Every structure is written in structure tokens, then in C-alpha cells.
Design an enzyme around this catalytic site. Structure first.
Site, PDB file in Angstrom:
ATOM      1  N   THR C  24       0.810  -1.220   0.096  1.00  0.00           N
ATOM      2  CA  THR C  24       0.136  -0.056   0.102  1.00  0.00           C
ATOM      3  C   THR C  24       0.870   1.193  -0.197  1.00  0.00           C
ATOM      4  O   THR C  24       2.060   1.164   0.248  1.00  0.00           O
ATOM      5  CB  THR C  24      -0.758   0.082   1.323  1.00  0.00           C
ATOM      6  N   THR C  25       0.109   2.338  -0.100  1.00  0.00           N
ATOM      7  CA  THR C  25       1.004   3.764   0.108  1.00  0.00           C
ATOM      8  C   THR C  25       0.924   4.512   1.306  1.00  0.00           C
ATOM      9  O   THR C  25       0.181   4.600   1.994  1.00  0.00           O
ATOM     10  CB  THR C  25       0.340   4.570  -1.116  1.00  0.00           C
ATOM     11  OG1 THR C  25       0.224   4.013  -2.267  1.00  0.00           O
ATOM     12  CG2 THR C  25       1.074   5.964  -1.445  1.00  0.00           C
TER      13      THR C  25
END
Lengths: 242, 242, 242, 242, 242, 242, 242, 242
Positions: C24-25
Site C-alpha cells: 500500500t501507499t
């Protein structure tokens, strides 16, 4: 020369038979009137989103349409041709092909891509249509699914889907769907499972109220196939949310 | 040009000769009247079930039929072609093919898939029929099994089976089966082994009373071949249970 | 015996140093008060969504925290251990580690995982903190990024991010971000880029108003680090939307 | 020497840390009282059924239990060991482990099998228990899921599942499950999704009325964990059917 | 166009030139009258028995016959074709082929399968016949053995064999066989070595008194070739036993 | 030093923990008195028979025994050790091991061969015994089966089998077997399935009346285990035949 | 159409241009009268003896012959064809080919097999003959050897050999042989080296007095080639022995 | 330290536990007196004969001896050690090892070479001896064969053999051998099968009257084991010939 546009190419122009922009989920429902297709619009090449407005479901002809899942590139050209194949056979034979004809033809076109398939670039469609030749015009809608090796299969359960979030959508329908229903109830259940598919699958990502991205749909009935309006869907997806 | 529909394609249209939705079990029994076929209806791609209502046995002609196990896609088109090969040979020759002919043909078509066979996509059929040319119309029922390389084989033991659960069903029949019997008793032993096959094999899964999924059957006699009724099966599998 | 909890494991319990649920970011911003982290909460193994509420940012100690992107399993245990590596050094030495210390330690822990990295199971963190030993308590916030081989890098540009949608977020910030600003303006710009990263990346998928899925955040200042509330984020992402 | 039965072997008997009989689906639901586990009983090595009476869920301790999906050989020994690890820690420390402890331990044992995992013989558990240390004894039931690299994850959605038919079951529950409910209602929804998991997955195959094969279950509450009776299950599955 | 049925296909229908049901042992003996062939009847694909009644020896023409060991599918079609090649050459030429012709032909058909041979699906025959053109009609019976690359070889030792238990049988005959003898004596020594071949080779398994599985045989003489009766075999094998 | 003979080697003599002569089938039945083992005696390396008088079932201790299938070499030393492990545990502890102990031990020894297992040289045992600690001395007979990774499994169906022809024998018993029965009836059903195993498997080959090769058996009861007599078997297999 | 039988196949029937039964040793000697060939008769596939009476030397035409070593199957057909290539050229041209012609042709035929050569199935011949066109009819005998790539080489040393035991024989002759000599002395020296080759080579195995296996020979002179008798060899090898 | 010379090396000198000169056939016979060993003498590395006077059978001790087949190098050192092992255990324990001891020891030494075995360099022995502890001193002779993984097996058929021509020899004996016989009759049957092995195997090559190469033998009886004289064999092999 057997009224197959395709087969003409076969002998007169053969050159027409995640490295590149992928697929998405597409749903199919049967109902009182006829049948319909609804499918996401997110094209993803990798984990990267490549396009969010790509139409996956097309109207093949007057009384039928199909959605294709797999490599965008290969899936587009294939359906366009299928459409042509059908139209040409009409202009020549004068009449249109049985539904069972259109399907067996689509299958052949799939069986033809099997080479590319075993090389990653696989595609698989979902065919639907109002069988002008069905005895009971009540259950005159039909759903045909396919193989990669080109098998043709009958729905016989009122619904089906193809694509990444198909396992999801198929499951949502296993609950949220019932036989003979409105062309409003079904188009509802569709936008639904297409929401659930988006839940358990980053590759789909159905209705997004914030961006204005709405599922594409198409209904076919004793009058023919018509592409549902952007309004009938959005004010329809807002209804589904809670 | 030898009355072979196939051979016509061979020279005028050659383009007609777990990645994709697998097989299932199919049994065959001989008896007083004639012979019959009974097969599961569960198609499984992977460990996942793909369809639970697929028909694996087809009536090839007036006095014969067959069931195919292996890649559904390949197996279907293959039997459809077999049917035609036969019908077309009739209309042209005016008469039908020997049973021994229909068989030798089917085997050629199988040998023809040997390529795909060695690439995973294999299929193998079970052919049965009432031999209108058999001396003793008592034992006029026949069962032919096949290789992958296209060998033809004679039953000569009243029963056979093909598919994942074949080993199991064969063994059941090795017990629950006896020669010359009713077209009610054999159809009985068929739904039986078809049950034991499902016991020791997750790829099969015969009679499911709860879902309404019953084995497909077909019997052939001096009157020809006819597909048993959904009723004659259910009220028959209920009898088998305990 | 050098005050390193880790090093104690090194010599007394060494057994503590897409097959499985991915990343994820995560974004980092600098500002007047101090610094902060905000990260998505979607864990994706394959194209399938595995979890949508996973916290990626943790508070390492009183005046620092970090978000890790990569194999969830390897990344969890790694931060926890870092935390402890820190707390233990304090309890023992009585004072806490320099920020440049905490970083060099975290780097060592990363360098350790390089083995698993080169086998797919990699992980990379983003470290932020209020440097209690910085001369100008105006620019006392800091951002450290890392390699896979264990390199330590200084932000020196007010923002950074790591993850699948990082290239996106980084770019959004290259626009929507300006130096010395509110801990309301930066918490705003973070939720923003965290929105754009989700636009062009099916692996991320930021603020989802329909589901109730909101980005996790944390702000460190001269008072220390504290985890922003679920309210200050939702009523904050609603503002961002249009 | 840290009260870890495991760690003792680690240093005093290290020799204890589809070729062989596979897995099946397991479900976990949260509710008013506490929580529960229900799981299939079909072990399948290949497409072949190896056993239809294998218990997949075990009670680890007074207030907790877990189900493990994956290679049966590895999954058995692993849970039996987890059991002991918990019991031994008690008898030594006098008190039992936090729930968060039991899970952290279980995770370490999983991380321990990572070697075997990356070789096919992988196993993954699902842990549940009544957190005697939870503030609101209302939502005191918990569900922890795992990685293969040993990640520990919180449910926070009231249900979960692992195994082949997990995607199925999880989806069934997404519809047929609602928060705070009876320990009759949840045990109901469990046997349900466990039925749906068997519908779309040959590897599972839940409640079988004809054979007498019923799902195994276990509920844990403020009184502790107790294995549900064979009666409470069958007369419960019969109800679910239609 | 050289009287070669084969060669006609070669130019007018080329499509006729343990995954699948294996071989078995076959013996060949010379004697006063003429010669004979006797061979097992067990087809084995794997370690599994596939059929126990498969005829391995066929009468090619009036004065000759052959047994083929190797993949059953390939071995059947090959001999059936050899049969035809011989018969067709006659009807065209009016006379039949020399024995040395029939063999040279058979060899070419074998050399033809070399491709398939080097891929596992190999087959090798054993040819016998009464050389109507032999000077001394005493030793007029002949035995020809083959290569895989298609070599033609003369017996010149009165006996030979092919198949798994060939080494066995050949050795049994090396003891139990003597030149010029009865067509009762040789048929005796044949059923004998064929018994010994079954002793040291699970793939064969000669005479089985309990099941009623008896070796297939064929004798050729100045009167021609005739297939020995099931009686002359059993009441012959019973004699051999002790 | 835990009364494990094995464990002693573990630390004082570690050097004791189809290229070579294979396996065969072994059956197990439960009954009124106790339980029993019956196994083939044909050792086959390749398709070639290596020995037809090898004993596959051994008496592990006073009240138990087992049969092993897989590489003969490995299987032998393995059971000999198992026996000792048990006897030695007795002499030291004064008492014998639970049945459940003997089992857990055997499984550890199997897990110990997992290495060799994944290299072809695998072996799997079948353990049976009269559980001197069973509440109901009626059903005091037990059958434990094994994995390759060393899983332990309870019969709970009165019968089992292991080996090439196991699938076949299991199926025979699935018919020719019934609960509580004579120690004459079960020994009967054992020689029976042991016959059907040999029918559909060239690697087995049970009772051979012509050669004098009879199945090895052993029964265990409240009196202990005893190896059935060559007579009680032959005059028993003669009875089975027809 | 160049008088080449081969070349006729080249354009009108191209289909005529240790898995299988190997080679042996062959010797060639020059002398007063003319030249000769003598070769072993043992064919060995593996370490196993396949035949002990196979003729390796053939008379190509009136004034020449050759022995071929290598894959028996490929070598047989190759010489036969050479023969015919020769005879046909005569019948057509009316005269025969130069010896240098016959050789260059044989070389072409070898060059053709290079394909099969590089796949194990290689073959190499030895060609001898009385050059009717040699100036000094004293040294009119000749020996030609070959490559695998089809090279033609002149003896110019009175002797040569090819095969497994060639290195041996060549050496024996390097001693036991002298120029201009009897067709009795050379037929003697040949049987000799053919004896020594068998001493240091299990693949060969020359004169075996016990079995009656004697080396085959052939002598060509101004009268032509003739095959030595079985008497002139045995009573000749007996002399050689001591 | 358990009286195992070997085991001493194990702990005090571990460095003592067709690229190179191969094996040969060896036979074993039981009889009235005792037992005996006879084995070829040809060592072949490739198809090339490396030595024709190598002794393969050695006298292990006073009442036993064994022949080893496989890599000469590895087989020699192994038997020499086995001998030592036996002698040392006597000088220490005072008495000699049971026969069953000597064998289990030899097995261990074989099981030890299993590493090299799977690398081509495999060896396998044939053990024989007069069992001083056998009840009936009539059948006091014994024959033990081995595995490569170190299995120990009892003859129980009067004869056996190992090596390339073992299949041959075993077959010859199946005919030319009968129970209780002379130590002249047996030594005769031995030299016989050893002749037949040589017939069908270039790797053996038994008695060669012309060269003076005679089979090596050894007989053991109630007096002990003695190596038969070169005279008793040659004037014995001459007798066998015809």
C-alpha cells in the site's frame, strides 16, 4: 461463401484472425422481460489503473449482446468482428442467425484465440440475447458463457458473470437475485453484485459515486437490445448504497 | 468424398479439426435389452466447481450414443462432430454405418486430438450402441472404450466407465452388477456406482438429493436410443439411498 | 550489552531476526510544528483485496514513528521490534537515542531483511520524527527513507512517500504542497495525494466515503507524536472531495 | 526458560520444529456471548477424497481455540504444539497468557513453518477466543487470521474464514451475517456459509445429510470453550436446508 | 500406384500414417509343420491393469501373422494397416507378396513410427509365416523381429519373443525348446515360457487358471494360418501347471 | 533419556535415522474380537517382480502391529526400530505405552523420513492394535493411517488399506465388509479385497493358488497379537475363489 | 535421370532417405590377389547381447563390397540402397560405375544420414573393391573409409577397420600384417585382429569356438567378390587359436 | 565401543566410510552340505574390457562369504571392511556374530554407500553362510541379497544372483537347479547359469575355455568356507559345454 464474414477473411485476408491493459468483471441476469448485461469500466495493466471509462459490454445485433473479459486489445477486435459476422450473415442470407448460431460462431472465434490464450493474452466472453425462437417468450432470455478452448455453455440459473470479481459477483447474486423480476429489479441486483465484486477485488472497483464512474449496462427484450442511460444507473447505484 | 463429413473439412476447411472447465465420471452397462450410459454433471476447473448441470452423454445416432471425459470444450465439439460424421454418412450412402464403423470413426477423431492431448487438453470417450448386425440380438449391446492415442477397445464384461471416479465406479459395479438384467436394474447399478464414484472423488459428486442434481442417462435397445427422464432418475436415486 | 535489544537477540535468541498479504501507499510531510505520516489501509495479495482496515503507520516512540510498505507480515514484526529496540535503549541508557540513532538502527534492521528482500518478501519503511536536538526547532521535523540493502536517506524536500501509489502521491504533492504550513494544511495535503495515489493505482485506494475507510495519520511535534482521530480525517477527506 | 515450551525444544530437542492429505474450509463468527469456529471435515489429497471425518478445529485452551487449513500432517502437529505451549506457560507462570500473547505465539509457530510453506506444505490457522481482558465483555470474542510469513491480523468484522471455500463462505456471510446475535443464530450462519463454500468448491463439501457428515463446531464464551454436539449440528443443518 | 495401399495414403490421405494402455509379452516358435505365435492378454497403463483380454497376435494374411508389443493404440492401427497393405497388393497384382516382401513392408511401417517412438509411444512387432517359396518345406516356418528404427531381422534359432517378459520367456525357451517338434509340443513350450515371463514380470502375467485368462495363439502351416481354440489352450495350460 | 530408544540414537548415534525394491498392498479390518492386518507379499522394482514371499506386516508389540508400504529397504528398518522403540520404552518405564503413544511415536519416525520421501524413497505404515485402555472392550480394535509428512489418522470405519492396490481393496471392503463380525469373517473379507486389489493392479497380485503364494495376516485381540497360520490362509483363499 | 536410383527417390518418393540394436567390429585387408572384409556378428543394444549371427559385410556388386558399423537398422537399409544404386546405374548406363564412383556415391548416402548421426543413430561403412581400372593389377585392391559428415578416405596402408573394437584390431594388424600376401594369409590376419578386438572389447567378441559363432568374410579379386565359406573360417580360426 | 570396528572409524577416523571399472554377474546356491558362491571375473568400464581375472567373491570369515556387484573400487574396500568388522567383533567379544548379525552389519555398510549409489557409483552384495545356529543343519546354508538403500533379504528359494547377467543366470537356475544336491551338482549348476548369463550379456562372459578364464567359486559348509581350486572348475566347465 457460407455467409461467414470471418471465413472470407480466412481465405482472402488471414492477417485478421501484464504487458497490455487488462480486464474487469461483467454480470448477466435473466428476467421476465428479457436479459441484461452490466460490467465494470476499470482497465488495469498490473496493479496500475489504465482507464476507468472503458465499455466492456457491446450490443452484437438487434436481439443480443455480449461482454468480453480479458486483454482489452484482443477482446475489442474480437467483439467488433463478431458483430460484423452477424450483420453480414443477415445481409446475405436475408434473415438473421439463430441465437444458437450466433453463439456457436462466437465460440469458433474464441476457439481461434486459444493460441494467444495459452500465451497470457486470453479473453473470454459472456453472451446474452432474446431468443426470437424460444417457445415460451417468458424465459426467452438466455446466457451463454465460454471456455478458452472455445466451449459454449448454457446459463440455466438466471445469472452469471466473468472476470476477476466474478467469483464475488456470482456469490452476491446467489443471494440478492430471484427469478422472474422487473427490468428494474434485475438491473438493481446487477449494479449490486458489481458493487460486491468491487469490494473483494482491486481489479474491478464498481460504482464510484465520488468520481462519477458508473457501471455500463444493456437490456435486451422482445423489442430489442438498448443501452441503459447514465441516469438510470447513477440514480440507481445511489439507491443501492445502504 | 468418401462420405466422411470430417474428411471433407480435412480438405476444404481444416480450421475445424486447469485453464479450462474439466471433467467427470461416466458409466456404461450391458443388459438383456440393450446398453446404457449414465454420467455425472459436475464440471470442475481446478478444485472449484464450474457447473453442476452439464450433460456428458449424447445420442450420436438412432442406435448409439457416447459420453466423453476430459476438457469439456474439446469433448463437446468432438461429439457434435461425431454425430454429424454419422448422420452425413447415412444421407449420402443411404444406409448407416456398421457399429464397428461408427467406432473406427470416433477413434480417428480421437487420434486427431492426440496433439492437444499431450498438452493437457485431453479427452476420452465411451461409446455404446445396439449392434443392428449382431447375430444374437440378446447380447446386441456393446461398449467401446478409448486410448488417448486413439485406440479402440471392446468392453466384453458388461460394464465400463471413464473419468476421475471411474476406478471407483468400476469397482462398485465389479460387485453391484450382474449380466443379463432389467433396463431398470442396470439403470439402478448405474446410479449406484455413480454414487460410489462421488464418494471417493471430489471431481465427481454424483446424485445430490438436496440440490436436485441427478445423473444423466440414456438407454439404447432394438427400438433405438432414448434419454431417460428426470423422474425415472430421481425416484430411482432415492431408492438407491439406503 | 551495547544497549541494543536486537543485539541481545543476535546472540541469545537468533530465531527472531504474492504468497502473502501485500502493501500500500504511505506519505510523509514536513511543516511548521513538526511532521506527520498518513497511509492507506488496504492490504492486497494478488489483485484480490485481503483487508481494508490494516494500520501501516505506527508510533515508534515519544518523538517519532514510521510507516512500512511491503510484505505485511515481515513489516509488522519489523516495526514492533524497532519500537522495542528504541524503548529498551532508553530504559538502559536512561536517555533516549538521537533521531539519527533511531534511524541508523532502523536501517540496520532493514539491512537484515535484505535476504528475504531478494526473494520477493521485501519491506521498506518511512521514518519521521521531531528532532529534539535540532538547532532551529522551526524545521525540527524530519523524514528518512530507505533502500532494500539498508540505506538511510534524508528527505530535505518536506515530503516523501513509499508504496505502490507513491509515484502518484509524490507527484500530487509536487503540486498541492508548500513549506511551513498548518498541521491542518499538511494533514490536508496528505489525504489529498493519498487520494490521487488511489486514482492511478488499484493496489492503494485511499479515502472511500461510501465504506467508511479513512487514511490513517499521525503527527509528531514538540509535544510528541499522537494519532489523529477518525473524525479529524473523515470530515477532512469530505472537504478534499471537490 | 522463558516459560516457552517451544523455546525449550528449540534448545534441547530441535527435532520437533499433493503428496500428502490436504485441506478444507473453516469459518469464524463473532456474537453477543463470545465467538465460535465451525469447519468442514473433508481431507482431499488431489481430487481424491482422503477422509470425510477429520476434525479441523481444536480447543487450544480454556478460553480459546483455532482451526488450521493446509497440509493436515503439518497442521495437526502445529496446533497440538500450540496447545502445549499455552498450557505449559500457565503451569509455569501460574497464570495464563494474554489472548494477544497466545496469538503472538501462534504466529511465531507459523513463521516457523515458512520454510515448508515455500515448498507446498503450507498451513494457515484461524484463531478465536474470549478475551478475558477485554473492557466491554460484550464484544469480548475475537478472531485472528494469519499469513504464511507469520503475520497476525485482527478480524474486526465479526467473521472470517480460511481454506479453499473461504472466498465463498466469506461472501455468504457478507450477506447472511449480522452483528450481536444468538449463539444459535451465528452457529446457524456458520453452517450456512459452510454450505455455500461446498457449493462452489469441490475441495470442501460441507453438510452431507445422506452420509451423516456434519461440520465441526466450537463456541467460546465467558464460561469457556465447548465443542458443540453432533445433535445440535445435524438438527441445525436440516433447518438450514431450504 | 506401386500396389502399396500405404503409398496411396502417403499421397492422397497423409492423415493416416504411460498416458495410454501399454504392452505385454509375445512368443514365437518354429517347428516341423510351420510356426506359431502365442502372446499374453494383459494391457497395463502404469502399474494398473487396464484390460486382461486384449488380443496381441493377429493373422496378417493367408500364410502369415504377427504380434506387436508397445503402445496398444499405435500397435493396433499399425497391424490393421499392414493387413490391408498385404491384401490390397494381392488384389492388384493378382498374386501375393513374397514373405520377404511382407516383412520389408512391415519394417517400413515401423520405421514410419520412429517419430512417435522417440517420444515414448513406441511399438515393435514379431512376424511369422510359412514361406511358400522356401526350398525345404520342412523349415518353411519363419520368424522376423524388428527395431524401432525399423530394422528387419531373421530368427534363425527357432524361437523369439518381444515385450516386457521377453528376456524371461526367451530364457525359458533356451531350456524348454527343441528343434523340429509337434505343433502340440511347440504350442506347449510357448504357453510355458509365457508362464515363466509372467513369473518374473508384473507387466505380463500369463495363464491365469482362476480367472479364465488364457494366452492367445496362432499357428501357420502349409494349409495356412489358424487361430488356436480357447479349449486347446486351457486344457493345455492346465497340463503345463506342474 | 525420555525412555525413547530413538532419541538415544538421536544424540549418541545419529547414523541410524525405482532404483530399489518397491511396495505392495496391505489391508486392515476391525471386528468384535479385535483387529487384523493382511498384506500382499510381492515386491516389485520396476515392472519386474523382485520377490513374491516378502512379509509386509510385523507384530510391533504384545498388543499391536503394523504393515508398511513404500521402499522395502526403508520400510523394514523403520518397523524394526518401531518395535524396539516400544519394547525399550517398556523395560525402562516398567509399563508399556498407550496405543495413542505407540502411534504418536510411529508418526515421529515417519516424519523423520520426510526427507527421503520427497526423493522418491517414501514409505507409509498402517498401524493396528487392541487398545488395552479402551472403555468398551467391544470396539477396542483400532486402525491408524499415516501421511508422508507424518500425520496420524484414525480409521473410524472398521477398515483401511495402503499400497498400490489400496484404492481397489478399500472399494471391495466398501462392499464385502460389515461391522462387528467373526475373526473368521474379517480375515475372510481381507483375503477377498486383497484379491480384488490384485485384479486391478499389477504391483499387487494377492492369492496365487498355483504358486503357493498366500497373503500374510495377523490378528490382535484381548489376548494379544498372533500371526495367522499358512493353513488358515490357503484353505481360506480357496474358499474365497468362487 | 542422372542414372541415380537414389536421386529418383529424391524427387519421386522422398520417404526413403541405445534405443536400437547396435554395432560391432569390421576389418579390411589388401593383398596380392585383391582385398577382403571380415566382420564380427554380434549386435549389442546396451550391454545386452541382442544377436550373435548378424552379417555386417555385404557384397555391393560384382567387384566390390562393404561392411557398415553403427545402428544396425540404419546400416542395413543403407547398404541395400547402395547396392541398388550401383546395379541400377549399370542397367541404365550399360557399364558399371568406376570404383571412385561407387565410393563417391556411398559417401553421398552417408552424408545424408548425418542428420540421424548427430542424434545418436549414426553409421559408418568400410568399402573395399578390385579396381578394374587400376594400372597395376597387383595393387588393384582398395579400401575406402568414411566420416560421419560424409568424407571419403583412401586406405593406403593395406588395412583398416571400423567399429568398437577397431582400435584393437587396427593395432593387432599393425603387427600381424604384411603387404603382398596370400588370400589365405590375409584371411588369417583378419580373423586374428578380429580376435584381439574381441579381447579388449565386450561389444565385439570375435570367434567363439564353443558356440559355433564365426566371423563373416568376403574376398574380391580379378574374378570378383565371393563370400568365404563357413568351413574356410572355422578350420581357420582353430588354427589361429594358439 | 560396541565392538563395531566400523563405528570406531565413525568417531575416530571418518575419512574411511562409467568413469571407473565396473561389474559382473555372481551366483548363489544352497544345498545338502552348505552353500556356495560363483561369480564371473570380467571387469568392464564401458563396453571396453578392463580386466578378466578380477575376483568378485571373497570369504568374509570362517563360516561365510559374499560377492559384491557394482563399481569395483567401491565394492572392494567395502567387503574388506566387512571382513574386518566381523573379525574384530570376535577378537573383542570373544565369540563370532550371529549370521543374522553379519548380515545386518553388511546392510548397514551398504546403507552407508547409498549416497554414492544415487550418483552412479552403486554397489550391491550377495551374502552366504553356514548358520552355525540353525536348528536343522540340513538347510543350514543361507542366502541374503541386498538393496541399494540397504535392505536385507532372505533367499528362501535355493539360489540367487546379482549383476548384469543376473536376470539370465536366475532364469537358467529356474530350470537347471533342484533342492538338496551334491556340492558337485550345485557347483555345476552354478558354472552353468554363469555360462548362460554370459550368453545374453556382453558385460559378463563366463567360462572361456580358449583363454583360460574360469569362474571363481567358494563353498561353505559345517567345516567352513573354502575357495574351490582352479582345477575343480575348469575340468568342471569343460563337462558343462555340451
Amino acid at each position: 461463401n457460407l455467409s461467414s464474414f470471418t471465413d472470407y477473411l480466412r481465405g482472402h485476408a488471414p492477417e485478421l484472425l501484464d504487458l497490455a491493459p487488462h480486464g474487469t468483471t461483467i454480470v448477466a441476469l435473466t428476467y421476465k422481460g428479457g436479459v441484461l448485461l452490466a460490467g465494470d469500466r476499470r482497465a488495469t495493466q498490473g496493479n496500475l489503473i489504465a482507464s476507468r471509462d472503458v465499455e466492456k459490454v457491446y450490443v452484437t445485433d438487434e436481439y443480443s449482446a455480449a461482454g468480453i473479459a480479458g486483454t482489452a486489445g484482443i477482446a475489442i477486435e474480437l467483439v467488433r468482428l463478431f458483430a460484423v459476422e452477424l450483420e453480414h450473415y443477415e445481409k446475405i442470407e436475408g434473415v438473421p442467425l439463430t441465437f444458437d448460431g450466433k453463439a456457436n460462431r462466437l465460440a469458433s472465434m474464441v476457439r481461434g484465440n486459444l493460441g494467444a490464450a495459452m500465451q497470457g493474452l486470453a479473453v473470454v466472453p459472456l453472451l446474452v440475447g432474446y431468443d426470437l425462437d424460444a417457445d415460451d417468450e417468458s424465459r426467452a432470455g438466455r446466457i451463454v458463457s465460454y471456455d478458452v478452448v472455445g466451449g459454449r455453455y448454457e446459463e440455466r440459473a438466471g445469472y452469471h458473470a466473468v472476470g476477476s470479481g466474478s467469483l464475488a459477483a456470482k456469490s452476491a447474486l446467489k443471494k440478492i437475485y430471484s427469478p422472474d423480476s422487473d427490468e428494474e429489479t434485475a438491473l438493481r441486483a446487477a449494479i449490486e453484485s458489481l458493487y460486491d465484486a468491487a469490494d473483494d477485488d482491486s481489479a474491478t472497483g464498481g460504482p464510484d459515486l465520488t468520481r462519477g464512474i458508473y457501471p455500463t449496462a444493456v437490456t435486451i427484450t422482445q423489442a430489442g437490445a438498448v443501452h441503459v442511460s447514465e441516469e438510470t444507473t447513477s440514480e440507481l447505484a445511489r439507491r443501492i448504497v445502504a
